[PDB]
């Protein structure tokens, strides 16, 4: 059918892998294993259309800053993630993650995702203001532990990629 590519990015230990796995497997990983690079596949129905989403997991750690760019090419939608617990993760968005994505993938739809909303810190408008400052398709909030907001995050991603 329709095959779109999703690449998740963001600071280390911000909830990227857990978000991808609760969406593809309905499973919250317990032991934090820093991701080097990984790939998951999930099917989703949005607006009546069935789309297979390729979830490209990337590294937020600085040791793997030469490998993560290699996952950007031919991306259909970017998931720029931060932690509501971590205010410094939000400021790394316009300092590190927006400059990097807008260089390798300058015209890809971006969705700012505030992970770990069960830990409520970043106020929702602060994240919304960041989305308007970076030029994102939209701003979403979720918590992989509570499994709340996960479906809507990837429904917005499929919407932006289907365009």
């Amino acid at each position, epitope marked *: 059918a329709i095959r779109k590519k999703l690449v998740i990015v963001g600071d280390g230990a911000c909830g990227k892998t857990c978000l991808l796995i609760v969406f593809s497997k309905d499973q919250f990983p317990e032991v934090y*294993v820093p991701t080097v690079f*990984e*790939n998951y596949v999930a099917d989703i129905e949005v607006d009546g259309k069935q789309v297979e989403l*390729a979830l490209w997991d990337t590294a937020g750690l600085e040791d*793997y800053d*030469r*490998l993560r760019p*290699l996952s950007y090419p031919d991306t259909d939608v970017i998931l720029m993630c931060f932690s509501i617990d971590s205010p410094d993760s939000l400021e790394n968005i316009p300092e590190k993650w927006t400059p990097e994505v807008k260089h390798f993938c300058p015209n890809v739809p971006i969705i700012l995702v505030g992970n770990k909303k069960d830990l409520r810190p970043v106020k929702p408008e602060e994240g919304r203001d960041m989305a308007n400052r970076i030029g994102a398709f939209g701003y979403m909030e979720c918590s992989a532990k509570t499994k709340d907001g996960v479906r809507e995050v990837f429904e917005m991603a499929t919407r932006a990629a289907l365009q």
Partner: nanobody
Amino acid sequence: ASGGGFVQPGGSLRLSCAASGDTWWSSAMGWFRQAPGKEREFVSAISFYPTEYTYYADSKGRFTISRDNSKNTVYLQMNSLRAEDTATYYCAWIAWGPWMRTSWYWGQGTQVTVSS
């Protein structure tokens, strides 16, 4: 993915994998493993496009990953194997191509069994 066999605790084993396919090339490639019951684990990986860079997950020097450019083959040398390394070992490629989107490929996998 080839090279899997039955080893004793402390034994060695080298796995092999094609560095790139025919209809595609690889900008990077990694080794993964799946224990019985456990989930998929990242073992090691190398990069091709920027520079030949290696990435491991233990920093203990047990696993060594390399590329023989003559045979177009990546090797994963494993020393001092213990029963905790008993798993199916897969290969992954970041597949590039002239008229294909950059895709993620999974190899077939080879069985590794450490005694006890």
